[PDB]
Design a protein around this nucleic acid. Structure first.
Length: 139
RNA sequence: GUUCGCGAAAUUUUACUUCGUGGACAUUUGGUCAAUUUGAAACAAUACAGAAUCAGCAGUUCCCCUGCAUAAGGAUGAACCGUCAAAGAGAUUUGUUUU
């Protein structure tokens, strides 16, 4: 958890998205007290060093910044989201919501494969990517 | 209350109509192509998932064979033997077989 930096204003979020051209921007929207928010914080905290080349991971709190709540429709304790060149990325996970992310991923390798596949499909301008894993038993 | 099935009646055995009877009798979600159009905001155009394959040499790493170099190291053969050159001056001797 301490490994990943946190974004304390909406402008740190926005500039974090704008100033980074060549690698994905991954934000976890959620609060420190939640049960599901710390788990993806640990999972993403282990993965950050492997992936630092082709992606970077940041942290955002909903109570700290409530500005994006209505715009991206943030519900559930946590939503992970993926941004490439200011463009919100999108991938059909089988969860029925191709936007953002909700559930807690299990294995490191499955999440690194999601990051890798979203990245690779993102370099081609492709809006929708198809994950190798449809988890929809979860949602 | 809806259908399927069996028994009874009114008529031409199956058929309609009604009685006695055995089941079956929920709705949704997980279902978005991406890319592009100077405006009070709609899915209307514009694409439309088409969103290179055989062969050759060389080069790094080790091994062997054969050359040439270099550093060291060895083995053996080779018939004949070492304390000047020129010019000038002085001193001593010099009848017949092989010319």
């Amino acid at each position: 958890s301490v490994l990943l930096p946190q974004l304390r204003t909406g402008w740190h979020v926005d500039q974090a998205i704008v100033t980074e051209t060549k690698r994905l921007v991954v934000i976890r929207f959620g609060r420190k007290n939640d049960r599901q928010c710390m788990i993806m914080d640990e999972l993403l905290s282990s993965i950050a060093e492997r992936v630092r080349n082709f992606a970077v991971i940041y942290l955002c709190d909903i109570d700290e910044v409530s500005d994006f709540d209505e715009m991206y429709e943030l519900t559930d304790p946590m939503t992970v989201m993926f941004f490439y060149h200011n463009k919100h990325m999108m991938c059909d996970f089988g969860t029925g919501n191709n936007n953002k992310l909700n559930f807690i991923v299990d294995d490191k390798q499955e999440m690194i494969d999601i990051l890798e596949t979203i990245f690779r499909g993102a370099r081609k301008n492709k809006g929708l990517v198809v994950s190798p894993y449809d988890y929809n038993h979860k949602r």
